[PDB]
Design an enzyme around this catalytic site. Structure first.
Site, PDB file in Angstrom:
ATOM      1  CG  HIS A   7      -1.851   1.131   1.281  1.00  0.00           C
ATOM      2  ND1 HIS A   7      -3.105   1.074   0.719  1.00  0.00           N
ATOM      3  CD2 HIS A   7      -1.721   2.381   1.779  1.00  0.00           C
ATOM      4  CE1 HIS A   7      -3.706   2.246   0.863  1.00  0.00           C
ATOM      5  NE2 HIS A   7      -2.887   3.051   1.510  1.00  0.00           N
ATOM      6  CD  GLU A  17     -20.504  14.838  23.492  1.00  0.00           C
ATOM      7  OE1 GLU A  17     -20.085  15.041  22.333  1.00  0.00           O
ATOM      8  OE2 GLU A  17     -21.290  13.916  23.779  1.00  0.00           O
ATOM      9  CB  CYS A  72     -14.330  13.369  20.179  1.00  0.00           C
ATOM     10  SG  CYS A  72     -15.179  12.202  21.248  1.00  0.00           S
TER      11      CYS A  72
HETATM   12 CL   LIG Z   1      -2.069  -3.466   0.531  1.00  0.00          CL
HETATM   13 ZN   LIG Z   2      -3.412   5.212   2.039  1.00  0.00          ZN
END
Ligand SMILES: [Cl-]
Ligand SMILES: [Zn+2]
Ligand SMILES: [Cl-]
Length: 265
Positions: free
Chosen positions: A50, A174, A140
């Site tokens: 990735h 909050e 948050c």
């Molecule tokens: Cl991947």
């Molecule tokens: Zn990415």
């Protein structure tokens, strides 16, 4: 087995709390996150693949602030359901609290990043209800652990109130706040109020208008500074300008510059 460690960018971070990633994600030793798109993965190998493929070098949404290498991105949870779902699963690891990860549409998220030649690296964030019944300008908030106690947290707070000022409205985060949260808010509130008291007969509602800090929040801050008296059921600001300067002189690194803000309601 819960997720207990994550790898993101070049950091590994142990978890503080349960976050409800799908069961088979909990199985693995580490969870691996893309630092830009926040995609979560199970193995170092899919992580590495990735990394060389991903085109993102920054959060999605709009860059609504740039001073130096500090940037803030506005992401609408409706425009980007997945990124924001990922952000919330990440944050829930360190927020005890959080209660919302899958329903993200009602929220807009503000991403603090510090920029280098590689891209814009997420450092913390705060979410905010698009429409708040309770008047919360910060649903948050969190600074990622390795970045904590360095002014990023207080930058985020400052920033959430700058948006409130431009909406001509007062707000409070909050509750409940974490202990780091309490401290940072009380510290921000203190600095803002002291800084202003330095420069002649302001009412608490006057202070509330100028800062967008609620009256309760101003009152409770002024109590801890010992600069408010109680008279016939009314909170009265009792300030000695030599205790203002006295408090200031006593023991943020990065501050919001209204000029570099690029926003409007
Ligand atoms: Cl991947
Ligand atoms: Zn990415
Ligand atoms: Cl850690």
């Amino acid at each position: 087995k819960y997720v207990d460690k994550i790898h993101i960018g070049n950091y590994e971070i142990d978890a503080w709390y349960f976050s409800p990633f799908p069961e088979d994600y909990g199985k693995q030793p580490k969870l691996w996150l893309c630092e830009y798109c926040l995609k979560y993965m199970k193995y170092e190998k899919s992580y590495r693949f990735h990394l060389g493929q991903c085109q993102w070098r920054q959060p999605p949404g709009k860059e609504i602030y740039r001073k130096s290498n500090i940037s803030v991105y506005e992401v609408d949870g409706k425009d980007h359901k997945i990124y924001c779902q990922n952000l919330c699963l990440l944050a829930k690891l360190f927020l005890d609290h959080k209660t919302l990860y899958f329903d993200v549409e009602p929220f807009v998220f503000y991403i603090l990043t510090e920029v280098d030649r590689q891209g814009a690296h997420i450092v913390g964030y705060f979410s905010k209800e698009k429409e708040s019944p309770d008047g919360n300008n910060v649903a948050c908030i969190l600074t990622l652990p390795p970045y904590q106690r360095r002014g990023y947290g207080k930058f985020l707070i400052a920033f959430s109130y700058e948006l409130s000022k431009l909406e001509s409205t007062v707000g409070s985060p909050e509750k409940p706040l974490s202990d780091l949260g309490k401290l940072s808010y009380r510290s921000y509130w203190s600095w803002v109020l002291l800084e202003i008291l330095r420069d002649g007969t302001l009412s608490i509602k006057d202070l509330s208008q100028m800062t967008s800090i609620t009256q309760n929040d101003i009152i409770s801050t002024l109590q801890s500074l010992n600069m408010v008296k109680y008279w016939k059921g009314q909170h009265v600001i009792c300030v000695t300008p030599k205790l203002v300067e006295e408090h200031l002189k006593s023991a943020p690194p990065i501050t919001v510059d209204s000029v570099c803000l690029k926003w409007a309601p």
